[PDB]
Ligand binder design. Structure first.
Ligand SMILES: [Mg+2]
Length: 425
């Protein structure tokens, strides 16, 4: 009987700051689900952090050990919905949230590691493992509580069944053409126009600029870019939760002329009514949010209030695959596109599977959206993402693409990493 013998965690942080979040140090609360089977059989996952607090985030994950060690691998793998709820339904853990913040993300990491585990066992890349599950198996993994007023399991099944026929075709299409990507690398001011042109030349059909500090600057930067990009390249803007409702409206109306693909997080990630009010005031400028959205219940409300034109999704922010599947289904039912958030540490490696699984088994739509891409720390992963002319190549190796190089962990663990031992000297 294959069993999960250990839940190991590492506080891993990269000094990226030496290259509304200034000086962030991309970090990861790295989790590994060890078993007593082939050394090849293990689950990998991680929570993306930005520096301080990564140690508390790691401790939250380590606190989940008793819930997992001793569990039968086959039992976890055969009931991922049940495994997620064993963590999700621990009322004492819920008190620390519920389903939000540090505790919930820690849980999401362990859940993601479990899916990585199942994918490896099925010997398939996660996106395929997900898309090839029966409509019934998919639905069993999702938590429908608090969602019956917007998405019942029957409605979820309907969507998945109506898409089952084309799964074979979409799979081939994806493997042949890849998934659309967009860059934020040029948007972090002669550089703006330059980097923008290179982006287009590299094949990216969408670009995103940061805004929110000065209207004048934003107006100028958006103009220069629109003209430096042509009128057929999509250009988005991210305000990073900076504005209040009134200011956000006044601000975005001054950027409208430069053809905005969408404004990301114009206000607080908790303000559902606020995003809707902003959207109404700056029409037709599209509004989005999502990288910090706590759980499927807040997403449900975003959709219900018509507060978004499109939505971000994040692999490590919520309750793992189980929760993202629910969100993807919500988005599909309400007819709003999803542009996955990525970047940071391994976010690209992770979120690509979710987007690809959505295309194959749930929407069959990918040319109308794109996965975010940022060129950072990909070398620390065994299965780094591959961008071919502005598009994500479908991963082939088994898993969630979460596994990191031991040498990387050995070099950047905090504060005992070979680098951190020398640094603090
Ligand atoms: Mg952002």
């Amino acid at each position: 009987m294959r069993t999960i013998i250990a839940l190991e965690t590492h506080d891993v942080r990269f000094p990226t700051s030496r290259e509304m979040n200034p000086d962030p140090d991309y970090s990861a609360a790295y989790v590994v689900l060890r078993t007593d089977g082939a050394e090849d059989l293990a689950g990998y996952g991680l929570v993306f952090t930005i520096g301080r607090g990564n140690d508390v985030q790691t401790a939250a994950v380590a606190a989940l050990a008793e819930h997992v060690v001793g569990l039968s691998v086959d039992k976890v793998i055969a009931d991922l919905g049940a495994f997620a709820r064993r963590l999700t339904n621990d009322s004492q853990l819920r008190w620390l949230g519920p389903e939000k913040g540090v505790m919930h993300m820690a849980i999401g990491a362990v859940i993601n590691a479990a899916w990585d585990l199942a994918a490896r066992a099925a010997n398939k890349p996660l996106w395929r493992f997900i898309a090839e599950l029966t409509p019934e198996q998919l639905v069993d993994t999702i938590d429908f509580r608090y969602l019956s007023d917007a998405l019942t399991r029957d409605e979820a099944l309907a969507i998945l069944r109506d898409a089952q026929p084309q799964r074979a075709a979409r799979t081939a299409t994806l493997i042949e053409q890849g998934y659309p990507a967009y860059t934020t690398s040029p948007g972090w001011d002669e550089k703006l126009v330059r980097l923008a042109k290179e982006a287009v030349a590299d094949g990216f059909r969408t670009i995103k600029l940061k805004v929110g500090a000065n209207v004048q600057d934003d107006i100028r930067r958006c103009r220069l870019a629109r003209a430096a990009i042509g009128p057929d390249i999509a250009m988005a803007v991210d305000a990073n939760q900076r504005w209040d409702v009134g200011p956000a409206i006044d601000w975005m109306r001054q950027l409208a002329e430069f053809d905005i693909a969408w404004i990301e997080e114009p206000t607080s990630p908790d303000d559902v009514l606020g995003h809707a009010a902003i959207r109404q005031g700056i029409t037709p400028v599209p509004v989005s949010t999502g990288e910090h959205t706590q759980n499927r219940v807040v997403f449900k409300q975003l959709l219900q209030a018509g507060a978004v034109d499109l939505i971000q999704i994040d692999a490590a922010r919520v309750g793992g695959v189980n929760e993202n599947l629910a969100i993807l289904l919500l988005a599909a039912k309400f007819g709003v596109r999803v542009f996955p958030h990525a970047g940071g540490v391994g976010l690209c490696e992770l979120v690509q599977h979710l987007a690809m699984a959505d295309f194959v088994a749930i929407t069959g739509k990918m040319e109308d959206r794109a996965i975010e891409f940022v060129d950072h720390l990909h070398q620390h992963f065994l299965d780094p993402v591959r961008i071919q002319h502005g598009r994500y190549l479908a991963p082939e190796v088994p898993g969630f693409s979460a596994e990191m190089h031991p040498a990387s962990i050995a070099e950047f663990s905090y504060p005992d990493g070979r680098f951190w031992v020398e640094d603090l000297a």
